[PDB]
Design a protein around this ligand. Structure first.
Ligand SMILES: [N-]=[N+]=N[C@@H]1[C@H](O)[C@@H](CO)O[C@H]1n1ccc(=O)[nH]c1=O
Lengths: 201, 211, 212, 212
């Protein structure tokens, strides 16, 4: 019975950084990929087979997410597709994820599907202010196209999809983390809880 | 070295019911009051002394303003708690609007929960809380909870409850309590019913109690 | 020379019904055959309830604030013909039977038509017909206090049943369907009918539409 | 004279709305002495900085979006003398030296005065001088997007310096001082100058004022 923890929130809120800090603090980075007890799943790894809105729920393989997450709860070994954000291509290589005790699924629409919601025993939402998240993504998108095209895409696609699809799913959260990776108190709270789950007490 | 946890949130958001559940799941109700390891401190007990305005029915008083709370005694009470000293907490009757001479003796505990609408208002009190929690229940939901709570627990009629809430409770929350939400480390979205968030904090305290 | 339609949305107990009333009253319009400004309510276009829906309404389990409870096709068809300068027949909903009475209110083509409804801006086809969109923004707890007083004193409801229906039906319908339509508003009028500066601004503008 | 206060966050559309309003009236093609609608900016009333204040300004540690950086006494005095029909002298601020130039702008008494500013509704004494209070409500991330593109083109700073100053100074000053003054607004104009319906609503209102 693996423990599934759903982490949602807008882009550049700190979902990936919070999950990375939790796994790093739990020492899972040093363990081999077979003996990993806490793994991280990114929703962007499940983009559907490909001016276009990639923040819309239709752009995500909802059935593959549900099947993979369900097979994880069944203790089965699953393979996750790889997706590069630059070329929008799903490479033929797959990441093999062996049965782990705790699974973190981060995604802007992780709480959108009701079938995916009920899979999570604990649901966390990284609530970061909209302008603050834009400041983080603007710096993130140039370092990792043109600055005018980044603001055009965010205003036309990212911002409307967050308010229409992500924001309504904030009410399904059990715990809200108010600033992201910098919130060391909240991270230490979840790190303490996942380590408490591994021990069994 | 006691662990101070600050619990804030608007009125009727569930801070009292959450804290009461945290100590109940920890079995502190079965332990004697002198041997309690997790105690609860309510900000409503530290209301300032009352003769500032004798008339509270002819002209209401606005009890939700930070001026009506003894911020100096709150800082003194919490400071002596962090030092490991026994403290005496005053008793209050909301109807009598007076400070009873009898005090509740709270022995040094390992974990102390302080719940209050303005628990994160003063900076000197904020830094004492090692963990800051905020119960963020929607405004209309908190109003529906408070109306039903104030009619059964108190003998107030509905017209005075809504008039007192709109005139004083609502503006004081938005001016003083809402800006303090940013200081919170963990936000609990719905309150007492959120069993996943309560079990998370209960487990954290039980790990602190073991050492 | 098409009629100037003005959409007025907002949550319940926000003041939109009183805002529209005070606008027509300040204009002195309230002569149904020669009136230049009329007020239309989304409440007139409730759908007729099936036998299973009527039974759910008696038990208090029917959401009257949900888009499914309104005849969007009738609203769109009525507002589309109003723009074309035609008389429209507007239903007179009988809530006792939850159906439309045989009698109907005849609205003659007016120069300015006000459509007031919680979900006035929900339908896109209905939304594009409005040349001006007003949203009465009043705080949720302030509107709740208004509705609780209006439901207990004017209607005589049970307090616990009001708050139970609000949390279960009224609140989710507002946050899911009404609030997302606030971004389509051209002008947002806060605090409701007491905002006399905003009302006199809309009253003055309609007078300029009639004089011009 | 009709005083209209315009507030809202940075890059919301305040300056663009006021400029668009004045343009729709003949005021652009109206002589300077005969202008009936004039625009006043709160940026013209920055305080002269103390040597201690200027020291923090050189270090980049002075929040220019804070109420203390604005000359409230001079704003109140100038706006009061405008209401009395007096011709007033507004300063010309030199932001490099943080002082007032010897040259001043002469504002002849106009029938309608538009005062735009981030904290136009902060001082109660300045609020009560406005016959109409407008607030340009635009989403924070949208305004930040507008400010970034405006701060890179208008000035010669880099992107990382803009976002650092916005998160450190502009954002906390807006949420603490500018946002709580939104409740005093009589009308809320969303999205700024792109809101043509709201622009023509104020334009038609001012035109009706000029004709009595
Ligand atoms: N008649 N009437 N008015 C109302 C009210 O204004 C509207 C709420 O949108 O639905 C109608 N309404 C709602 C609940 C109910 O139990 N009965 C009812 O008639």
């Amino acid at each position: 019975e693996p423990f599934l923890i759903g982490v949602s929130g807008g882009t550049a809120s700190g979902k990936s950084s919070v999950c990375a800090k939790i796994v790093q603090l739990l020492g899972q980075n040093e363990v081999d990929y077979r003996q990993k007890q806490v793994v991280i799943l990114s929703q962007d790894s499940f983009y559907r087979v490909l001016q276009f809105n990639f923040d819309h729920p239709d752009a995500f393989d909802n059935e593959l997410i549900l099947k993979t997450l369900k097979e994880i709860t069944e203790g089965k070994t699953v393979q996750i597709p790889v997706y590069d954000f630059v070329s929008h291509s799903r490479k033929e290589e797959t990441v093999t994820v062996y049965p782990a005790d705790v699974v973190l699924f981060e995604g802007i629409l992780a709480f959108y599907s009701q079938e995916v919601r009920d899979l999570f025993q604990m649901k966390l939402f990284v609530d970061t202010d909209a302008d603050t998240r834009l400041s983080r993504r603007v710096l993130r998108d140039i370092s990792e196209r043109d600055l005018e095209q980044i603001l055009s895409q965010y205003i036309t696609f990212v911002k409307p999809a967050f308010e229409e699809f992500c924001l309504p799913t904030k009410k399904y959260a059990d715990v809200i983390i108010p600033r992201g990776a910098d919130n060391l108190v909240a991270i230490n709270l979840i790190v303490q809880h996942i380590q408490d789950i591994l021990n069994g007490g």
